[PDB]
Amino acid sequence: SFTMHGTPVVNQVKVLTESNRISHHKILAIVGTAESNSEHPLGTAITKYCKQELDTETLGTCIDFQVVPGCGISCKVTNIEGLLHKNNWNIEDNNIKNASLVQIDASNEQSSTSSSMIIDAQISNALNAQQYKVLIGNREWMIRNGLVINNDVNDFMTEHERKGRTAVLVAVDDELCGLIAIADT
Ligand SMILES: Nc1ncnc2c1ncn2[C@@H]1O[C@H](COP(=O)(O)OP(=O)(O)OP(=O)(O)O)[C@@H](O)[C@H]1O
């Protein structure tokens, strides 16, 4: 029992990774299938925009998220080979080894070390259980994810904010894929 009355509606989309990685139709598919499995108030407008395009309802498979209030969210979304089912426990930290392993005799010989247990155990899991790193929202995480922002998308962005609407970006596997304009209903 809580509020959800300030409803958002998706109003314009533009692409940035054109010809290089992902196209507009796969962009709206991966955002709409991610928000089909999330619990957010805003990105679910793209869930409908996708569901109404696909004419199917049966969209969204497993997600491994990291969420923030106001600043957007990040996750790993599968469907392409999700038939393995992943181990996801604390995995953004879950370390193979907090020590040397490329050439120990040249770099800090503390120990004997493990060389197969836990090492590769998460990488070979993901490389068979094929998956996709995606994030969406705000503007500061769009900076912090190692990306570059251009003066034309910024002139397009602040303009929707000047018009008093909701103005956000979408990133994928350390690339910028595109941007979204949204309004209130
Ligand atoms: N699924 C989501 N994906 C990305 N960003 C999201 C998501 N849900 C919310 N946001 C972020 O929320 C920000 C807007 O915050 P705002 O305070 O307007 O929302 P709200 O908290 O729902 O509003 P209200 O003040 O009515 O509670 C956007 O810039 C957007 O990035």
Swiss-Prot record:
Location(s) in or outside the cell: Golgi apparatus, trans-Golgi network membrane; Cell membrane; Melanosome membrane; Early endosome membrane
PTM sites of type Phosphothreonine: 166
Known tissue expression: Widely expressed including in heart, brain, lung, muscle, kidney, pancreas, and to a lesser extent placenta. Expressed in fibroblasts, aortic smooth muscle cells, aortic endothelial cells and umbilical vein endothelial cells (at protein level).
Q: Which residues bind ATP?
A: 35
* Role this protein plays: ATP-driven copper (Cu(+)) ion pump that plays an important role in intracellular copper ion homeostasis. Within a catalytic cycle, acquires Cu(+) ion from donor protein on the cytoplasmic side of the membrane and delivers it to acceptor protein on the lumenal side. The transfer of Cu(+) ion across the membrane is coupled to ATP hydrolysis and is associated with a transient phosphorylation that shifts the pump conformation from inward-facing to outward-facing state.
| Subunit structure as annotated in this protein's UniProt entry | Monomer. Interacts with PDZD11. Interacts with ATOX1 and COMMD1. Interacts with TYRP1. Directly interacts with SOD3; this interaction is copper-dependent and is required for SOD3 activity.
| Similarity annotation | Belongs to the cation transport ATPase (P-type) (TC 3.A.3) family. Type IB subfamily.
Q: What is known of its domains?
A: The nucleotide-binding domain consists of a twisted six-stranded antiparallel beta-sheet flanked by two pairs of alpha-helices, forming a hydrophobic pocket that interacts with the adenine ring of ATP. The ATP binding site comprises residues located in alpha-1 and alpha-2 helices and beta-2 and beta-3 strands, which are involved in van der Waal's interactions, and Glu-35 which forms a hydrogen bond with the adenine ring. The heavy-metal-associated domain (HMA) coordinates a Cu(+) ion via the cysteine residues within the CXXC motif. The transfer of Cu(+) ion from ATOX1 to ATP7A involves the formation of a three-coordinate Cu(+)-bridged heterodimer where the metal is shared between the two metal binding sites of ATOX1 and ATP7A. The Cu(+) ion appears to switch between two coordination modes, forming two links with one protein and one with the other. Cisplatin, a chemotherapeutic drug, can bind the CXXC motif and hinder the release of Cu(+) ion.
Q: Which disease is it linked to?
A: Menkes disease: An X-linked recessive disorder of copper metabolism characterized by generalized copper deficiency. MNKD results in progressive neurodegeneration and connective-tissue disturbances: focal cerebral and cerebellar degeneration, early growth retardation, peculiar hair, hypopigmentation, cutis laxa, vascular complications and death in early childhood. The clinical features result from the dysfunction of several copper-dependent enzymes. A mild form of the disease has been described, in which cerebellar ataxia and moderate developmental delay predominate.
This one is known as Copper-transporting ATPase 1
UniProt source species:
Homo sapiens
Q: What is the lineage of its organism?
A: Eukaryota, Metazoa, Chordata, Craniata, Vertebrata
Which gene does this sequence derive from? ATP7A
